[PDB]
Design a protein around this ligand. Sequence first.
Ligand SMILES: NS(=O)(=O)c1ccc(S[C@@H]2O[C@H](CO)[C@@H](O)[C@H](O)[C@H]2O)cc1
Ligand SMILES: NS(=O)(=O)c1ccc(S[C@@H]2O[C@H](CO)[C@@H](O)[C@H](O)[C@H]2O)cc1
Ligand SMILES: [Zn+2]
Length: 257
Amino acid sequence: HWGYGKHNGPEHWHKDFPIAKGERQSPVDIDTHTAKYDPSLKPLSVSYDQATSLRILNNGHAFNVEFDDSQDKAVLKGGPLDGTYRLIQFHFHWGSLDGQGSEHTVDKKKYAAELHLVHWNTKYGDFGKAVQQPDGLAVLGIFLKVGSAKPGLQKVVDVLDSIKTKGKSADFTNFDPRGLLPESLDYWTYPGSLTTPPLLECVTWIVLKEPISVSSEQVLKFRKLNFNGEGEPEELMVDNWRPAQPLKNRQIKASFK
Ligand SMILES: NS(=O)(=O)c1ccc(S[C@@H]2O[C@H](CO)[C@@H](O)[C@H](O)[C@H]2O)cc1
Ligand SMILES: NS(=O)(=O)c1ccc(S[C@@H]2O[C@H](CO)[C@@H](O)[C@H](O)[C@H]2O)cc1
Ligand SMILES: [Zn+2]
């Protein structure tokens, strides 16, 4: 029953998920002047050459592109991380307008959308166990701005008509998530949470500095999705973003000078 509407949106979530007002909640505003360069941070290692995409699902909140995470096929290592994080799914958050949609902000700047590549720590064996651990997840966050098309996104945009409503899924094999990356892997990193209920404080956030460009037509097709199930009143899936949460006792570190 949590959602992004007038009556079940982020300001309501604390009533069922009290951790909503916790000490390490996500997203946050990235104040670029206060983030400290950490020369001890390693380059990120994104190893997606063997990625196996399986399926795309409208879950009533976003759409997830799901991967085979039963082996080390698509992993994130290095940067702030200790050990190996396996890609399980990616999804986006986006706006009703180009002026909003991202969850993270940069000097209070909102982007049109934000991609989340979600990875779990293989020392915890499965995703359900990982989300119970302070270092269980690594989420790679990538900002989207509207401009030139992202060629590697179009296979996602073209299948959305087949999963318009909540609970619909479609086969989505041989998708290469490398086509969603910017040129540079420069990043900010801080400890945080899932940005949807249950808002567990289990995430190392790695947010890329360089946004990707998508076309107006690409993001317009995201905004044709539905939050509702088939045969229910149409509610456009837009503005599925949580706003910036208090930083509290946390330091955002930069991989770059
Ligand atoms: N975010 S949360 O999990 O704390 C949560 C929040 C709200 C509710 S009731 C709410 O009422 C509204 C007007 O009737 C309806 O329009 C909403 O759909 C319905 O969800 C239930 C749970
Ligand atoms: N925005 S975020 O990157 O912080 C984030 C938030 C939550 C999860 S998982 C959990 O389970 C599934 C997804 O596997 C989904 O179907 C569920 O709805 C979702 O709540 C994962 C990442
Ligand atoms: Zn997300």
